[PDB]
Amino acid sequence: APDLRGKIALVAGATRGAGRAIAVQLGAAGATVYVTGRTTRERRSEYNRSETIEETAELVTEAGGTGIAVPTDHLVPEQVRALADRVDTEQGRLDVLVNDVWGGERLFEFDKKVWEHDLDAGLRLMRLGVDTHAISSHFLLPLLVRRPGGLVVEMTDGTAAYNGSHYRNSYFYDLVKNSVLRMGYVLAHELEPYGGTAVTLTPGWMRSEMMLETLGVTEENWRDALTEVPHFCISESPSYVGRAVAALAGDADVARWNGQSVSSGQLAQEYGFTDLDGSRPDCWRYLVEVQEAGKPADPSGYR
Amino acid sequence: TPAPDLRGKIALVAGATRGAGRAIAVQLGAAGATVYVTGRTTRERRSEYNRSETIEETAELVTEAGGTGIAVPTDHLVPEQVRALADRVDTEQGRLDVLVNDVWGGERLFEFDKKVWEHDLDAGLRLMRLGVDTHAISSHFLLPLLVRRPGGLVVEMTDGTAAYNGSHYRNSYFYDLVKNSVLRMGYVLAHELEPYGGTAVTLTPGWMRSEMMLETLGVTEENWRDALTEVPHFCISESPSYVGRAVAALAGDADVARWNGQSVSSGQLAQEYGFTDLDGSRPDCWRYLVEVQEAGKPADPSGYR
Ligand SMILES: NC(=O)c1ccc[n+]([C@@H]2O[C@H](COP(=O)([O-])OP(=O)(O)OC[C@H]3O[C@@H](n4cnc5c(N)ncnc54)[C@H](OP(=O)(O)O)[C@@H]3O)[C@@H](O)[C@H]2O)c1
Ligand SMILES: NC(=O)c1ccc[n+]([C@@H]2O[C@H](COP(=O)([O-])OP(=O)(O)OC[C@H]3O[C@@H](n4cnc5c(N)ncnc54)[C@H](OP(=O)(O)O)[C@@H]3O)[C@@H](O)[C@H]2O)c1
């Protein structure tokens, strides 16, 4: 298991989903983790959900690290500048930056062409999914490149290999996920002279809070949903991609990944971690070799 | 090779005041097309670019070249104006054969060789909005008319090929993200258009002798090789009309669907279709950049134009 004691991490967009679980797994490895998001105990966010950023910070501490909640709208440069100033003030360093901010799960429309998709929702989802990462990198990378060994993880949906041959959901969704892949390549070029590393990371099919609610199940009985969604047998908990980030952050030779697109399932094979249940789902190979091949849902050999 | 015959075709070049946009519109007009040309700069008000070329002037050049240019001043960041533009084309023509998403507007906003934390942030966010959202809004409102019958063509204008950009960081963070998003737009739109018999490609010019570029170098088109002492690798450059002829060749290709989803360059298409630049040459910018300039060889256009 990675030892991240003494490390300073920041997960931008950590209220729920992968962001929360990445922050928690970094804390479970001993890191101090700044966690940002809009939903507080006082105010709900555009998502209109009940998970709060303060709750994430407490879960990071409970897990064995230190969670510091900083409510932040990552579309507001002044707030992200203050966030960078705070980390410098309190810690003088930043080892790991995870640009997780997405916020578009309610805005994209599946199987609508660009002229059928609601336009305002599509433009909004691209701004949330792209500009937040640009703003975060703009203000937080100076601290990260102050000394060698920094790591940036850009969070997307899909690998370069999968997305390179698959249209992803609809026009706006697809442009975001492929821009975040490009961000990993671009930041790898900018960080390498400083001894910094950038990767783009995707989870598999995540059993997020939002996903489990849609399926009407809890984590403890998630396989109850398999009659309704048989290919959900490849799914993983959000902690799996969290352990992938922790494994990268703990890798003394993480620069071997610079610029690459990686997946949680690929990194589980590489580093040997498992999901909470001991399995190692390999979503993107499963999607190609089983589901898109027309075969019946069957997880054998893929987790 | 003989010039494409686009008589009877309806085209729209979004962002056609100057540069590639103007030249694409004029070369479509020279092939006989009716061309709607849009942009913010009019004879009464200058645009964010603060330049003197106007969208009315482009429309007149389209007509002079042998087509019909219809200027529609439009801010492509304003959905209501782009909706009206689409309604107008439907009203006047009932069809749209060729859509060229040329809108860039970022030439003065990107910063060469600044890291993302050094680049001015507001300018970076602005050029991404101008370079990406304008294309999304344009496709959203104009593609319904285009897919009404088979044979429509959409050209997404970017900088670089998929092959070149896949292995090259392009200028700086924000610039790079735009050019690579527009590459992805061609792939995405090809998927959405194919069931309708529509085709999408992403096209890049080479090193263009645009109005802005020639001013930066202190030369006119008639004596552009005067700049070679200061910028030797400018020997690979092409006029904006070259990429205009590339669009006209795609628009005239009965089998243009063979390109669906692909990234293409003006130099690649000149070899494919046989057109030339105005001076009779066929510059091959992206092969030259890799095989001559980046290999450390002295500037020498032999074999590349
Ligand atoms: N169900 C899923 O979430 C799911 C499933 C499969 C794959 N993925 C992919 O995995 C990646 C990570 O997604 P995720 O699960 O972490 O998605 P997410 O929950 O949409 O994003 C993480 C958090 O970022 C915060 N955020 C959004 N906009 C913000 C802003 N302007 N300022 C500050 N914070 C903001 C949101 O919390 P606040 O509302 O509190 O700000 C949000 O809950 C995404 O690329 C996604 O496509 C997600
Ligand atoms: N050597 C080169 O210059 C070169 C080389 C390779 C690739 N490329 C690429 O080729 C592509 C096309 O280039 P270009 O020369 O046509 O660039 P451009 O002149 O920046 O774009 C064409 C016109 O679009 C208009 N426009 C911008 N924003 C607008 C908005 N919000 N609403 C309406 N119209 C708007 C502008 O006219 P108004 O100001 O009147 O609106 C602009 O002059 C660009 O992506 C460029 O990067 C260029």
Q: Write the DSSP string, A181-248.
A: HHHHHHHHHHHGGGT-EEEEEE--SB--HHHHHHHT--GGGGGGGGGT-GGGGG-B-HHHHHHHHHHH
Q: Is B248 helix (H, G, I), strand (E, B) or coil?
A: helix
Helix (H, G, I), strand (E, B) or coil at B154: strand
What is the distance between the alpha carbons of residues B272 and B261, in angstroms, rounded to a whole number?
17
Whole-number Cα distances in Å, A204 to A23, A264, B87, B205: 17, 7, 43, 38
Whether the CB of A110 is below 8 Å from some CB of chain B: the reply is: no
Q: How far is residue B37's CA from residue A231's CA, in Å, rounded to a whole number? A: 49
**Residue A152 forms contact with B (CB below 8 Å):** no
- Are B129 and B173 in contact by the 8 Å Cβ rule? The answer is no
User: What is the atom index within ligand 1 of the atom nearest the CA of A38?
Assistant: 41
What type of residue sits at position B74?
A: T
Q: Which amino acid is at B143?
A: L
Which CATH number fits the domain that encloses residue B262?
A: 3.40.50.720
B188 touching chain A per CB within 8 A:
yes
Helix H or strand E encompassing B288: helix B285-288
Q: How far is CA B258 from CA A23, A30, A165, B263, in A?
A: 47, 55, 17, 12
A52 burial type by CB count under 10 A (0-12 exposed, 13-18 middle, 19+ buried): buried
Q: Give burial (CB, 10 Å; 0-12/13-18/19+) of A111.
A: exposed
Please, how many CA atoms are within 13 Å of residue A284, restricted to the half-sphere of its CB? 23
What is the three-class DSSP state of B152? coil
State which amino acid sits at residue B29: G
Q: Are strands B98-101 and B68-73 parallel, antiparallel or unpaired?
A: unpaired
E runs forming strands in chain B = 10-14, 34-39, 68-73, 98-101, 153-157, 199-204, 263-265
Evaluate whether B20 touches B243 at the Cβ level (below 8 Å).
yes
Question: What CA–CA distance (Å, rounded) separates A148 from B88?
Answer: 57
Contact status, residue B34 vs residue B68, Cβ threshold 8 Å:
yes
Residues A97/A144, Cβ–Cβ less than 8 Å = yes
DSSP secondary structure code for residue B69 in this structure: E
- The total number of structural domains that make up chain B: 1
User: How far B117 CA lies from chain A's nearest CA (Å)?
Assistant: 4
SS3 B160: coil
Give the distance from residue A137's alpha carbon to the nearest chain B alpha carbon, in angstroms. Answer: 7
Distance of CA A199 to the CA centre of its chain: 11
Expressed in angstroms, the distance from the first to the final Cα of chain A is 20
- Under DSSP, is residue B30 helix (H, G, I), strand (E, B) or coil? helix
Cβ–ligand 2 distance for B210 under 6 Å, the answer yes
B280: Cβ contacts below 8 Å, ≥ 6 apart: none
Which structural domain range is residue B43 located in?
10-218+240-284
Nearest to A123 by CA among B203, B49, B137: B137
Q: Do B187 and A171 touch (CB under 8 A)?
A: no
**Residue B303 belongs to a domain:** no
Residue B127: inside a domain, yes or no?
Answer: yes
DSSP for A66-116, please give it: EEEEEE--TT-HHHHHHHHHHHHHHHS---EEEE-----TTT--TT--TTT
Would residue A209 count as lying in a domain?
Answer: yes
Which of A102, A156, A236 has most ligand 1 atoms within 8 Å of its beta carbon, as the pocket-test mutant?
Answer: A102
Crossing angle of the two packed helices A119-126 and A171-191, in degrees rounded to 10: 10
Tell me how far apart the alpha carbons of residues A237 and A206 are, in angstroms, rounded to a whole number. 6
Residue B183 and residue B156: Cα distance in Å, rounded? Answer: 8
Question: What CA dihedral angle connects A286, A104, B120 and A152, to 10 degrees?
Answer: -40
Cβ A249 vs Cβ A7: under 8 Å: yes
**Does residue B193 contact residue B143 with C-beta atoms inside 8 Å?**
yes
For residues B79 and B86, the answer to whether their CB atoms sit within 8 Å is no
Residue A94 domain flag: yes
Q: How many helices (H) and strands (E) does chain A have?
A: 11, 7
Tell me the CA–centroid distance for residue A18 and ligand 1, in Å.
7
Q: Does the annotation flag B288 for ligand binding?
A: no
The CA-to-CA distance between both ends of chain B, in Å, stands at 16
Which among B21, B5, B4 is positioned nearest to B61, based on CA atoms?
B21
Q: Which residues does ligand 1 sit against, CB inside 6 Å?
A: A 13, 15-19, 36-39, 45, 47, 53, 72-75, 100-103, 105, 128, 132, 155-157, 203, 206, 208, 210-211
Resolution in angstroms, to 1 decimal, for this deposition? 2.0
Contact across the interface for B173 and A190, Cβ inside 8 Å: yes
**Residues B221, B129: Cα–Cα separation, whole Å:** 31
Of B76, B89, B50, residue with least CA distance to B131: B76
| Residue listed under structure tokens 């983790």 | A33
* Atom 47 (ligand 1) nearest CA: A157
Any known ligand binding at B47? yes
Nearest CA in chain A to B117: A138
Breaks (C-N over 2.5 A) in chain B follow: none
Judge whether B15 lies within some domain.
yes
Q: Is the residue at B226 inside a domain? A: no
Q: Which ligand 2 atom minimizes the distance to the CA of B107?
A: 20
Q: CA-CA distance, A268 to A251, in Å (whole number)? A: 13
DSSP 8-state class, residue B3: P
Residue B40 token pair = 């913010």
Chain B residues touching residue A122 (CB < 8 angstroms): 136, 140
